[PDB]
Amino acid sequence: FVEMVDNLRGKSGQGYYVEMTVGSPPQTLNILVDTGSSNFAVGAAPHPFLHRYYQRQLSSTYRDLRKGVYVPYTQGKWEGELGTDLVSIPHGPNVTVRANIAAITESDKFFINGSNWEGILGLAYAEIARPDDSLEPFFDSLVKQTHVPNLFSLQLCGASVGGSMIIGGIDHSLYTGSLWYTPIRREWYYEVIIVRVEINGQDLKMDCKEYNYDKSIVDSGTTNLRLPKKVFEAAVKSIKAASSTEKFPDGFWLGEQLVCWQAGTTPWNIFPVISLYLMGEVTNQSFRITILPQQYLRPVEDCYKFAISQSSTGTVMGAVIMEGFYVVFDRARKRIGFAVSACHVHDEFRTAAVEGPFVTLDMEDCGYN
Ligand SMILES: CCC[C@H](Cc1cc2cc(-c3ccccc3C)ccc2nc1N)C(=O)NCC1CCCCC1
């Protein structure tokens, strides 16, 4: 899989993208890797922000589906025209597939000014595809039409950031130690269940049901570790108490302002390790993933933003989490694998860890219904 190593690029806070081609002859586009959505959508009109866009008139293999899509989000939206065409991943497997493409013809607050991407690769399941679950997502199409195994893995590293998307397999040089798997609870988002949360080694004492209300997901499209309201409130309270050597304004924890120490005077050791215990493969068995402050304190263009925030969507395990680990999306076995990333940023002291097994009872009770 050396072919596919280091095939992800991006800037600080604007996601990870992969190179793709679309149409015949192939048109090159940089496409955002997003495990929290299910649509394959690309710019198809000359928006001022775009380096390039999908030109349907140029592709002999384009077929119109005569159907539109309006995709609203909390803030902003994109609208598009549905069709199919030949899609390929230059630094992926040596295959070409007919996938659904949403050609974006109108948008608001989707494209980033300065960004180097022109579309989005939704890698989640059909249920959350717009307009409905009959629009087959790209990966489902890939597996159906080829001999590529039904799995992919992500190593998100990190001005410029980089990483790897291994399609149809695992590259063991991207992780140290051993992979531990948590089950995909249901195939819509990549849903998982958190059964315990520790900060610096001390339990939060919360009913695990509230760790997963109403969802817990693994999402390469989200920057922050997003926690549910109550969980966030208890977490920061505990993180504030853990770091009392220095004090910061009430706004910094809410991500409303910035914190600064220059000269390279970053006292990481004042800040606690966060740990998430996830449901294991076996009854009553769990494992834990541990992230360093150098994961939830990201540099801003030395100054840092607190990258843990509220959510009424549930727990979102974003780039803050994923950058510490090699993440295997084992779709074939309905499981997600975590192992310590070979590229995660640590100091000479603490590291990111994936440890187990642990004994945890009543894990099913942690899922919301
Ligand atoms: C708990 C899940 C968090 C996850 C965050 C997430 C938001 C996104 C939002 C957009 C998007 C769309 C239109 C306009 C502007 C933006 C910024 C694109 C991609 C997105 N990718 C994401 N992973 C989420 O809200 N997913 C549900 C939907 C998936 C399909 C697109 C709308 C959002």
Side-chain angles (χ1 to χ4, degrees), residues 34 36-37 73 77-78 109 120 189 215 217 219 222 313 316:
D34 181 20
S37 74
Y73 181 55
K77 57 100 174 198
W78 66 260
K109 296 163 176 188
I120 188 157
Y189 294 95
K215 275 168 278 153
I217 71 147
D219 188 11
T222 303
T313 28
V316 176

Side-chain angles (χ1 to χ4, degrees), residues 10-17 30 32 43 47-52 77-78 104 107-120 221 223 298 301:
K11 298 253 187 57
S12 175
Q14 13 166 130
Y16 291 84
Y17 58 80
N30 285 332
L32 223 49
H47 190 279
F49 296 169
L50 294 178
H51 284 79
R52 43 203 180 175
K77 57 100 174 198
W78 66 260
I104 306 165
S107 70
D108 186 55
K109 296 163 176 188
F110 179 69
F111 297 119
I112 301 164
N113 191 22
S115 87
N116 201 237
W117 55 270
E118 298 86 54
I120 188 157
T223 301
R298 29 179 265 98
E301 37 206 292

Side-chain angles (χ1 to χ4, degrees), residues 53-369:
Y53 49 96
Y54 182 27
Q55 293 187 319
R56 282 168 298 174
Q57 71 276 9
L58 294 186
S59 163
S60 47
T61 47
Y62 170 80
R63 295 172 193 172
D64 206 297
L65 275 167
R66 294 144 148 82
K67 200 180 167 194
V69 231
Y70 177 83
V71 178
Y73 181 55
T74 306
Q75 214 169 220
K77 57 100 174 198
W78 66 260
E79 195 217 50
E81 294 165 9
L82 288 180
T84 71
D85 211 336
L86 299 179
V87 188
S88 150
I89 310 161
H91 301 284
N94 205 298
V95 286
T96 302
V97 301
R98 182 161 294 270
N100 292 307
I101 305 170
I104 306 165
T105 53
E106 191 154 32
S107 70
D108 186 55
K109 296 163 176 188
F110 179 69
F111 297 119
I112 301 164
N113 191 22
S115 87
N116 201 237
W117 55 270
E118 298 86 54
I120 188 157
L121 186 56
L123 294 169
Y125 295 99
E127 190 176 305
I128 60 152
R130 285 102 216 285
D132 57 61
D133 63 14
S134 69
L135 197 76
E136 187 176 60
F138 168 85
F139 208 87
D140 310 61
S141 274
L142 174 66
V143 168
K144 227 153 201 186
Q145 293 168 37
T146 70
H147 296 293
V148 172
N150 195 19
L151 86 151
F152 64 91
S153 50
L154 298 172
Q155 191 209 43
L156 312 179
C157 301
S160 271
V161 301
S164 291
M165 180 180 186
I166 313 300
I167 326 263
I170 297 155
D171 188 322
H172 310 297
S173 74
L174 298 170
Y175 78 87
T176 56
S178 167
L179 273 166
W180 289 81
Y181 297 99
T182 194
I184 287 164
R185 193 203 179 187
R186 186 164 55 83
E187 305 160 321
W188 57 327
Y189 294 95
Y190 289 99
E191 194 186 348
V192 296
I193 290 160
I194 302 157
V195 300
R196 187 180 164 102
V197 183
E198 283 179 3
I199 311 176
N200 212 57
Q202 279 173 135
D203 195 15
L204 253 31
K205 254 269 295 300
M206 270 185 286
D207 182 359
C208 65
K209 207 155 202 161
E210 293 295 286
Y211 294 147
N212 308 293
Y213 174 72
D214 62 300
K215 275 168 278 153
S216 288
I217 71 147
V218 187
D219 188 11
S220 58
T222 303
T223 301
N224 292 355
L225 202 213
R226 284 172 77 190
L227 302 167
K229 188 123 155 258
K230 286 173 71 181
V231 179
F232 169 81
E233 277 173 5
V236 169
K237 194 271 182 70
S238 173
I239 306 162
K240 280 199 272 201
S243 51
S244 279
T245 314
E246 280 205 309
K247 200 175 181 176
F248 317 109
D250 264 298
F252 165 67
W253 304 106
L254 284 162
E256 289 174 351
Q257 57 173 246
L258 188 68
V259 71
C260 295
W261 323 284
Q262 222 201 304
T265 56
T266 334
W268 302 111
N269 299 260
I270 308 304
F271 291 88
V273 299
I274 310 290
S275 286
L276 302 173
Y277 292 69
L278 315 168
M279 178 189 286
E281 303 196 76
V282 175
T283 310
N284 286 335
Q285 171 268 311
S286 68
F287 67 94
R288 68 149 179 251
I289 60 154
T290 303
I291 65 163
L292 305 174
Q294 31 259 116
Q295 264 82 241
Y296 65 91
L297 258 44
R298 29 179 265 98
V300 190
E301 37 206 292
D302 310 1
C303 298
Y304 302 93
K305 184 183 173 163
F306 186 64
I308 305 166
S309 56
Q310 299 188 320
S311 173
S312 70
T313 28
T315 305
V316 176
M317 292 170 67
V320 160
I321 296 294
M322 295 189 79
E323 285 190 344
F325 316 105
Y326 186 63
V327 191
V328 186
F329 293 77
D330 191 354
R331 287 155 63 100
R333 302 200 220 277
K334 284 185 71 175
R335 64 187 186 174
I336 290 172
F338 293 89
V340 177
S341 183
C343 78
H344 83 101
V345 268
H346 54 86
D347 49 33
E348 208 212 325
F349 307 61
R350 309 176 288 192
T351 340
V354 186
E355 292 159 4
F358 292 91
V359 171
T360 321
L361 307 159
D362 304 324
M363 293 187 296
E364 247 88 60
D365 287 347
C366 309
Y368 163 80
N369 299 285

